[PDB]
Amino acid sequence: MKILKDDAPELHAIAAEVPHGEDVKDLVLDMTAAMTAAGGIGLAGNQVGVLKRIIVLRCPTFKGCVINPIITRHTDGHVYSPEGCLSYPGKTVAKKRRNKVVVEGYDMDWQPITIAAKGLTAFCLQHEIDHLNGVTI
Length: 137
Ligand SMILES: CCCCC[C@H](CC(=O)NO)C(=O)N[C@H](C(=O)N1CCC[C@H]1CO)C(C)C
Ligand code: NI
Ligand SMILES: [Zn+2]
Prior knowledge:
Keywords: Metal-binding, Zinc. By secondary structure, this protein is an alpha+beta fold. It has a single domain (about 1-135), classed as Peptide deformylase (Peptide Deformylase), CATH 3.90.45. About 20% of the residues lie in helices and about 35% in strands. It has helices at about 25-35, 120-130, and strands at about 40-45, 55-60, 60-75, 80-85, 95, 100-105, 110-120. The strands form two sheets. A five-stranded antiparallel beta sheet has the order 1-2-3-6-7. A two-stranded antiparallel ribbon has the order 4-5. Strand 2 and strand 3 (about 60-75) form a beta hairpin. The protein is globular, with a radius of gyration of 14 Å.
């Protein structure tokens, strides 16, 4: 895979729900490989031109994939999160993020998963889910 150029339309497009049970194992392997090759701690389908709701992470309290991730709970107000993005190398943006989130979805074997995250890991989850909605830093 390749991390798309900063002017790619896919970065602003909405990623489609993955049909329940679809085999995404190779896709997740490829995405994880693209993420680590580019030196990132997360990656979303849009960034590699895959308009499917899949994210991969290697963050302090969560490492792995989430299929069809959704934020089901978050803290009120916002905190400071300085973020760069692999799709826009060179740029760091002071983002407002929820300090804590719960994300739910499925793993590669279609088992339901729940991730309770705070700080950096919460920021990563929000950053990647944003990508799936075509929202970038
Ligand atoms: C921080 C919220 C999630 C950031 C995820 C990005 C990767 C990305 O573009 N995902 O879509 C990353 O690894 N960004 C790094 C990044 O922003 N980091 C890594 C350490 C913490 C934070 C810098 O404040 C670098 C490459 C810019
Ligand atoms: Ni490649
Ligand atoms: Zn990004």
